[model samples]
Target: HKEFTKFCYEVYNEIKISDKEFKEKRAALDTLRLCLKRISPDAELVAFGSLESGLALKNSDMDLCVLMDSSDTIALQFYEELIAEGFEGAFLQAARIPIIKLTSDTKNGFGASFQCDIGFNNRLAIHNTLLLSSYTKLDARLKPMVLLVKHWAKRKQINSPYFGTLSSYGYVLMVLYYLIHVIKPPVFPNLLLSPLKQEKIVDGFDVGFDDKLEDIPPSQNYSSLGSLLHGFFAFYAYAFEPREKVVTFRRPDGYLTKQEKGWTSATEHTGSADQIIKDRYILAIEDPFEISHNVGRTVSSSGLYRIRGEFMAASRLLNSRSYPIPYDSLFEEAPIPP
Candidate 1:
């Protein structure tokens, strides 16, 4: 187990963001922000997602949002301006919202090795990023735990939201749920359980969480990173019944039920273009702030089975009594089923 713990940290040390990448990301963001400003002076570009939350893996794409009123119109203008300025990107308007997808290989005065998605008025994402950032600051173990889970999911080919699995954000929330409630002498306090002094309402949901780390007492649970990882897998593999439960970090008890939340069955929802989107619940992980949004709605029936199989496989490898655990295979890429 000690060796496994060492292995996890070794990967963490290699994959976590570095000082050089930090500078590069900052430069890339500034370059884009400046470009956006040239089009709309009042609009501001802000970041969200893993990088902003400090749980980013090496060379992860940047997620930016343009802040302004009538964002759709402003976003279109921004996209056109970017194209006229010789930026290599596309204005994608196929989904629920329009987004600008940008990529750059060489510096070309746009910063090297950059990939980003720019959206408009993504207030919830920014608030969620801040919440995740606050949690990362509360404990040193939190960041590595999330990174490893994300890496494992990516390698296992189960992190694609578009392909009917789960998003990285959903997995992050899962880890937070375990650390906060599943573990005895939990590693994290339920920051959202007790609301802070100020009220923050965004997109019709309460987005407040305790960010005052100094005021909270240190966790008595001194489990090593490996042990926490092992427990996390074990908990999801056996203890958590995805069919019956809802994985939510905001609840005092760490979870609700599919039946209780009226998420017992799957349904279809209409998108902006009247295109049918399947809302699934083979796994139900509720968004902390957006009470009505099921973060795990992306998981299909087959996807849930694969995810559970992976969890059980991970638990088996981690808990094995064999002298030299066959742990290396856990991180190996799994072939996607046809």
Candidate 2:
């Protein structure tokens, strides 16, 4: 267990964003800001996502949101300018909102060394980003544990929402839920439920979380990262019932039943583009601030099957009591599909 915990910290140090990467990220944003100035001087660019949340891995994409007082037409102009400026990628309008996906270092291969996603007016995401950053500040163990879980999810190929799996944000929320609610002697106080009552509503969602870390009591739980990681997989693999529960932090118990959330079955949703979206409940994880939003709605039946299978596999790997744990096996990338 000590060996596994040490390995987790080693991986954390290896993958966590470094000063050089931070500089590169800033430089990339500076180039982007210059382009925006040329196209729309009045538009404001805000950084959010893993980078802003401080949960970023070395390969994490830079998430930028453009706040503007104008039409969506300007978004298209911005896209054209970015492409002309040698930033290669696509402008996707088919999503709920239009977004730009760009690669800063596109050296001819499909894999770009550094990727970015720029969207418009996603204020809730920005607020959530700040909320995550606040929680990160509270505990030293929290960041490493979340980062390790993220790395495992990425290596297991279960982090792509478009592939009917959960997003990195969803995984982060799951870990947070475990720490704040699942484990005995909870690793964190539910910040959302903290008594600092200053509340601000963003898009009808109360985007308020206690930011005063000093006022918050530190966790009584002292479980090592290895044990916590093991518990995480074991809980989701064996304890959690996907059909009957919603993975959430809003509720006092850290979960609401599928019946309570009206998420018992799959449903179809109409997107902003008037496209039909098949919202699945095979894995239900509610967005913390956006109570109505299900972060796990993207998880399909097969995706959940694969996710659960991986969880069990991970649990088995970590369940070992050997001197040297098979930690490497836990993160070994799955075979590429034919």
Candidate 3:
């Protein structure tokens, strides 16, 4: 345990080079701002995730959102124009939103390769929507702490103990869960307050914080501590509690034992190969902008394309690593079509 802790701290230190990272990220933001202004003057572009949130790595992509309060048709047209104007590796897929993927093919390249999502939303829709609103409501305190936990987890090599693979976002979520549910004093105060006020009921369950217990089947006989912990976090997911209004900061105790059991079962059922492949695709949509919707469309168009592209990219990576083949050869044979 001591050695693990040391490892975690080391990973945290290595990855937490924010001062150096900021310069590069700021440069990317500058270019993006220029692009947005010249292309869609009325649009509001915001940076999120590693860039805005300040949890980026040396190889992290610039996560950006191009939001506009305009007609979907016009927004779509604008995206088309941007792509036609020489945004390399640009394409529209899934729900028909344009994505400009920028990356550095080699170290110290002229420009970084990032997957950017372009979408539209009404001013009101942008402000009141649950997804968009939640991003704003996110506990500012939790963001940095979550990033710290992620660094530790990676260093300790326990980052993906479940299936031996995890995406950066997955690590973020796990750390967030730990802070919100397990850690005492609660790393993020908002996380604790929100669930408590929202749920009318609360209880305790055994969460098995540090146990060697493996393949444990789901049962009510387990600890209330664990259920309470997960319930406190999962309640705000929007899927479970849609009527929640005026986000509160109190924790709640929902029936998360079943959910926990199901998650464990799913994890155990899926082999390491499946988990790795699954995570590879997830890493593609790591940007928060992919989830936000457009004004005309009920769902996010660019976000959907990002997911598809993520899977395609993941498949390519898997093929390249799993088989003895050059990446360029594989890409040349079956290039991803726009």
Candidate 4:
């Protein structure tokens, strides 16, 4: 057991970014956040995504969500000034509110060179990012497992949300779901259902719970990272019913079915951006705070199939009880099925 735990810690070290790398991003974000603040003094600039959630990789891009009073003209004016001032990004009308994406080429005030995404009035991302931060605070092993899983997914080429696959956020949600509901004794509590009276409303939904992680307890399962990783794959491979049920941490009962949620069919609905959004339940994963959103909506049927196949392969490899764990093979890229 000691050896297994050691191996997990080592693997974690190998995958996670060094403090120096994180500092670089932190420094980059501080400079950029301030720059945005200067542009729109009243607007609230929030950094979200993996980096903000403390689950970021060395190469992760910085994600920012800005909140302010609705004004399309101000949005355009800011973006126009950015372009004129050589910010090296563009504004688009693809969505209701224009999007401003700055790449490494941008001449922003950030001391470090980086890419940044600025979404006006996008506050829901902040709440979800905070929830993830809360989960990591619950246990030390939680972050290590997430880092490892993210590394594997990237190598396996299943993390492209735009290309009919899942997003890193979706994958992270899956990891949390498994640990919270599938794993016996749960690595962490489903904080969405935390019994504390604390509550806050967001997007017409209650996204509140006591964040006193230190006061709560980790699961008594006592499973090592190695054992738990194996369980994670096996659970998805042989035990999970993706089509019949959905993964959600917000429910107090720790369970929900596609039928009960009225998600049995793919349907088109107006999204937050006022765009026609076609959401599929093939690989359903509900966002913790964005209650109406499915993080896995990007996954198509083919993507779901490929995901399942990879899950089965990983499950078989780890559950085989080999002399030495074939950890290296876990990094082999799963050829994108043509």
Top-scoring candidate (TM-score): 1
RMSD of each: 1.8, 3.0, 15.8, 2.8
Q: Where is model 1 more than 4 Å wrong at Cα?
A: 70-72, 105-112, 195-197
TM-score of 1: 0.94
Show how many residue pairs clash in every candidate, following the order shown. 0, 0, 26, 0
Residue 181 Cα positional deviation in candidate 1, in Å, after optimal superposition:
1.2
Cα distance off (Å), candidate 2, residue 323: 5.1
RMSD of 4: 2.8
Per-residue lDDT over 126-198 for candidate 2, one digit per residue giving the tens place of the 0 to 100 score: 9989889988998888899889888889888888889878898899999989888999989888888877847
Candidate 4, TM-score vs. the true structure? 0.89
Q: Is 3 or 4 the stronger prediction by lDDT?
A: 4
Candidate 4 displacement at residue 177 in angstroms:
1.4
TM-scores vs. true structure, each candidate:
0.94, 0.90, 0.46, 0.89
Off by over 4 Å in 2: 83-86, 105-114, 271-275, 336-338
Position 16, candidate 1: lDDT: 88
The C-alpha stretches of model 4 lying farther than 4 A from their native spots are 1-7, 80-86, 105-113, 270-277
Q: Which candidate is the best by lDDT?
A: 1
lDDT of 3 by residue, 73-172 (tens): 5555555555554444444544454444543322222344544444333222222222222332343334334455454334433333333334455445
- What lDDT, from 0 to 1, does candidate 1 have? 0.85
Models sorted by lDDT, best on top: 1, 2, 4, 3
